[PDB]
Structure formats: C-alpha cells, structure tokens
Nucleic acid binder design. Structure first.
Lengths: 51, 168, 102, 83, 119, 26
RNA sequence: CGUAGCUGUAGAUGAAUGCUAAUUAUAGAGUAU
RNA sequence: UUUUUUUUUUUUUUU
RNA sequence: GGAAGCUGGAAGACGGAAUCGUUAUUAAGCGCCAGGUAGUCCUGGACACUGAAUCC
C-alpha cells in the first residue's frame, strides 16, 4: 500500500493481472465505438442486405 | 431434368392397417359437399401384425437386439417376408376411411369393432362438449393480447426543434 | 412494314407470372430470415417448404421487349433483337454509345 | 479376349497362397518402404506410416530377418490398417 | 522454386503466442482444445458432458477419430469457383484467435492463461 | 475444374498461402 | 503466375486418376451403396 | 553499401 | 452438382498410310479472370509470357 501503491496491492488480491485486464479496457472501448457482432450463432441473417 | 424432392420415393408413417387405395367395388359417396373436406366412404380392411415368438434361434437373436434397444435399427423390423411369412397372421375385416375432397389423400382408417364402440359412448362423449364451452370465455380474454408491437412514439407529434418550447 | 413500338410490350402470360413472384417474395422477405434464425440457435438443420413458392430463386431473367427467358443481360435487359432495334433507332447516342469501335 | 479375365483371376488367388505371413519382407526394390507397398491395402501413405514406428531412415535397406523383428513389424501393421 | 508461401513467404495459417516461443497451424488447434477438455470444464464450475469420449488420446488416431477432426475443420482456404480476382480468401486466424483466447486453454510449452495472438 | 489444368491450379494456389497439399497424382 | 535458373531423390520397363461405407461447401430441398 | 542488402518478372494509375 | 483423403491389376507404347489448314509477336505450349443476378462445364467471348522453321 504505502502511499502510491495503494490501488496496486488491492487489485492483486482481487485477481487482477498486468496482462489480462490491460486488453479488457481496449475491448470495452472498441465494442462501444464499433458494432457488437462477435461471431455469435444466428447473427449471419442480419448482415445480409435486403433484396 | 431430375426430380424435385426425394421424400416421395420413401415410405412414410405406418398406417397400422393396410388398405388398397384404388377401389374396385366401392359404392357411391353421399353428402359431404358444403364442408368440402374429409369425405366419408366405405372400403375393405386388412389387419396385419407380427409376433416374434415362432422365429428360429438364428434370426430371433438379431431381431430382438434391434427392436428392444436404446434406438431403432433398420426400422426395428426385418426385410420383406421372404421366409418369415409363415409366422405372419392376418385377418380380413371390413373397415372405412376418409379422403380429402380436392387433394384426394388418405387420412386414416378405423376397425369395425371400434366403430360400434363409438355409438355406445355417444351419451358419454356428448356431455364432454359442455365442459369445453365453460372455458371458451376465460380463454378469450387471455388469447386476445397475444400480439407484441413496438411502443408508439409519435403521440400526434410536435415540431420540437427549439421553438416550440414556450407553447408546451 | 412497321417496326414495333418499343415502349409497350405485347401480351404474354408467362412474362406477367414472373413479376407476380417478385411481389410475394418482397413481403415474405422478412419471414425468410426468421426461419433461419430459429434453426441456427437450436442447432438443427431442417427444410423450409414454405420458401418453395415464395423463394428468391423462383424468379429468373426475362426480356422486357419480349417474353423469352433466355439471352437477357443485367446491363441491357434485352434480347438479341431488342438491343439491335433500340440501337438502330437513335436512342443510345445521348448515353455515350459510339458504334465505330469494334 | 474374354479368357484374359479368367487367366488373370489366378493372380488374385496366388496372393491368398502367399498370405498367412506377418509381412512379405522379400521384394524387388532395395528400399524397405517401397517393398512394403507390394502388400494389399497399403500404398504410398500407409507405407510411410508403418516405418514411423520402426525408427529408421526412409530409404533404409531391409535388415536381416529375425524372429523378434517380425512381431514388432506385424503389430504395427494392424494399428495402421485400422485407420 | 516450389516453396511454400510464394515469393513473399506468406503465412495465413499460423498463430503466434505472446509468451514463450511456439507456433502451430490451425489443424492442431482443434486437437489441443479437445484433449485439454478437463481443465476447461472445471474452470466454468449429460448434454453438457457430450465430448468426454473424444478426450481419449488413442481414439483420435483411429478411423472414427480421424473423421471427427476433419468434420470441424471445414478447410476455409477452399471456396467457390467464382471467388476469383479481388474476391480472394483472407487469413481465418481472426476467428480462431478469439476462441483460443476466450476458452483459456493452456499452452503446451508453459502452463499459462490466454496469451495467444494473430501471427 | 474438370481437366488437369484448372484442377491443379487450386492446389498450387493454396501452396502459396501457407499450406502444404500433397500434389502427387492430378 | 506457369514451364524458371539453381538443387535432392529411382540415368521411372511400374505414374494411366475412373470405380467407391463417406466427408468439405452453396441452396428451402441434391437423398440411398 | 568493408556496421549496405541477404533478392525472379504481369495485362489502369505518380496528371 | 463441384472438389478432397484413403484404397488402386479398366483393357493404352497401335501407327511413320490417311483426312482436317497456318498470309510470323502467325503456329506450338503454359498461366489469370469478366458475364452468365445461390452452387453449376473440357465450348464461345477476352488479356498476358517463352516463342522455332520452310521453296509459300
């Protein structure tokens, strides 16, 4: 904890790592500014334009 | 120039009782005109059943393994009766069926013995219709709201760009 | 004698039948995707007999100045004779058609 | 003309007479893998698969016949033949 | 002359890993996830336990096991005959990388969590 | 792709994309 | 881009590619050995 | 380029 | 209907005779796609590289 390392130690006990949660922030912002499609089963019908 | 569907070249659901669709000595139909569906006609029935008891030791072992199992194998029956026809028992019994007006397709048949049982149960089946009418009103209110639609936003809509706002 | 008036085609029962399927498919286009979505979610492949008579593939190319259902392109929408008469009557000049090049 | 079909049929029966052995080690080529292909049900694919368990070079000349060597070779063929 | 990858030594079937040094084609990806099914099932916490028999090492090398692996792998490189010119197949590693990282499958080299990447 | 010309093209095309397909016959 | 150049194998008497218990893809439906 | 590279070529374009 | 794995002892080294024609980036080989409004050909259309000889 000390002074500046207050939040680093607390996150370690919760299970945070400096590699896994780093990508979660990038994905969270990416999914907001872009579409929500993630290859789910059944989303192939909504992509085809109407004829 | 091939066929459209391959399902027509296969045997569908078993009819239990086998009846010759093309008649030879059928009478003339009567009534069943306004409805134009499920015409009534008389024909000849032919019952058939299989009792796997008289089969040999060679063929009985394989037959039972396919019938009484977790899943059906080879339709749970042997091929054409090349040698099992000896144990086949069939009794002729007059029967009737129904056919479609325009489509002219067979629906089902009933045995003569079952037909007489329906007449004896007329009093028992007639009273059963009264119970259904009781629930007719109850189900009307619940089945009427079975239509999901989006919420209407327009509300006989305003022009709310900036003005009007004091008008509101 | 008198070349046909290319603005109004003659009567043809088969030609009119092709256009009939177009309207049916457009209204039923929404229902087509619903049938595929339910099967995909459940993970089972099954037929859709209802799409046979209202399918997109039931419609095919046809000649507007005609009624034959062969030899029609997506650019000209005309048969061999339909393009020849239209080009020789002086109608494609405004649309950038120079027959000088081979 | 038609007698050729019956005459060539004797060759198929001759294979059954040559059977009853774990593997026909004798062959025409020097390479063990190429000679092993003479057997029925084995080709360029299955020929290399058998040699994988032998732990030897691809173009390895056939070694001397041994009683204990046949058992290992015969056992590997059954595993490969399963598919 | 007849090298694999062409002039530019293309590689549209391999995936790199952030940790350690080890790469494999998409063909081995299917076998790795199936073999390490016990770890994946326990991570989350019958119809659910349907692929248990496929975890056997010897069953995969049999005739039945060979067909199961080929069924899942659809060979994305192969497509329609009209897919010519600009309409050419791209690297399918984008979809494979997502599944391999979300499933939390350990790497054969070193036991680690999701560390795979496209490469 | 029925003849040996067009059919072999598909196998050679996949060889340049980072795949190995047996070649051998046809 | 293909026959490349270059360079390993058997300086093929034995390279013919059709037959099929069996899967890959499009499509509402192309199935049974 | 003596701390430089580590290599075959296409059918529209540096207006 | 198209392609692929495995398996492989389908019928062919016949004939130097004869009939279809090429005015040289011709002839002979090899490789690619544009349209045919889901897939769906060894033909037709269309581009590019190696590219010899003769008395025509």
């Amino acid at each position: 904890m000390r002074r500046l390392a207050s939040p680093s130690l607390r996150r370690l006990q919760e299970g945070q790592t400096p590699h896994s949660m780093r990508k979660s922030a990038v994905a969270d912002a990416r999914k907001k500014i872009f579409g929500y499609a993630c290859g789910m089963p059944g989303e192939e019908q909504w992509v085809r334009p109407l004829q | 120039t091939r066929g459209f569907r391959w399902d027509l070249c296969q045997r569908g659901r078993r009819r239990w009782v086998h009846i010759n669709y093309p008649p030879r000595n059928r009478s003339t139909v009567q009534m069943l005109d306004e409805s134009h569906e499920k015409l009534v006609f008389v024909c000849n029935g032919y019952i058939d059943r299989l009792d796997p008891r008289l089969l040999p030791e060679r063929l009985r072992k394989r037959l039972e393994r396919n019938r009484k199992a977790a899943l059906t194998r080879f339709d749970g029956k042997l091929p054409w009766g090349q040698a099992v026809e000896s144990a086949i028992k069939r009794i002729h019994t007059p029967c009737l069926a129904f056919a479609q007006a325009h489509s002219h397709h067979l629906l089902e048949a009933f045995s003569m013995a079952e037909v007489l049982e329906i007449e004896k149960l007329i009093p028992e089946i007639r009273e059963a219709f009264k119970a259904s009418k009781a629930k007719l009103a109850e189900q009307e209110a619940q089945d009427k709201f079975t239509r999901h639609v989006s919420v209407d936003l327009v509300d006989l809509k305003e022009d709310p760009v900036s003005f009007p706002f004091t008008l509101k | 004698l008198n070349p046909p008036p290319i603005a109004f085609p003659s009567f043809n029962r088969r030609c009119q039948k092709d256009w009939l399927a177009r309207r049916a498919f457009a209204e039923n286009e929404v229902n087509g995707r619903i049938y595929k979505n339910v099967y995909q979610n459940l993970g089972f492949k099954g037929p859709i007999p209802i799409l046979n008579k209202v399918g997109q593939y039931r419609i095919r190319m046809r000649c507007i100045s005609g009624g034959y259902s062969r030899g029609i392109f997506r650019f000209t929408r005309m048969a061999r004779m339909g393009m020849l008469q239209l080009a020789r009557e002086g109608w494609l000049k405004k649309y950038g058609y120079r027959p000088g090049l081979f | 003309r038609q007698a050729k079909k019956q005459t060539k049929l004797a060759a198929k029966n001759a294979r059954k007479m040559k059977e009853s052995k774990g593997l026909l080690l004798e062959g025409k080529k020097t390479a063990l893998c190429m000679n092993l292909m003479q057997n029925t049900g084995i080709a360029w694919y299955r020929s290399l698969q058998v040699c994988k368990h032998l732990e030897m070079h691809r173009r390895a000349p056939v070694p001397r016949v041994t009683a204990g060597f046949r058992e290992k070779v015969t056992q590997a063929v059954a595993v490969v033949k399963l598919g | 002359a007849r090298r694999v990858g062409g002039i530019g030594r293309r590689c549209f079937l391999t995936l790199h890993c952030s940790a350690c040094s080890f790469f494999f084609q998409t063909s081995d990806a299917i076998k790795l996830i199936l073999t390490q099914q016990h770890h994946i099932l326990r991570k989350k916490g019958a119809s659910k336990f349907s692929l248990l028999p496929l975890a056997d090492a010897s069953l995969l090398l049999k005739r039945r096991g060979a067909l199961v692996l080929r069924s899942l792998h659809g060979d994305p490189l192969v497509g329609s005959r009209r897919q010519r010119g600009e309409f050419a197949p791209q690297a399918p590693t984008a979809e494979m990388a997502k599944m391999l990282n979300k499933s939390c499958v350990p790497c054969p080299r070193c036991k680690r969590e999701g560390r795979w990447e496209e490469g | 792709c029925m003849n040996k010309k067009n059919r072999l093209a598909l196998r050679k095309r996949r060889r340049r994309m980072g795949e190995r397909v047996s070649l051998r016959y046809r």
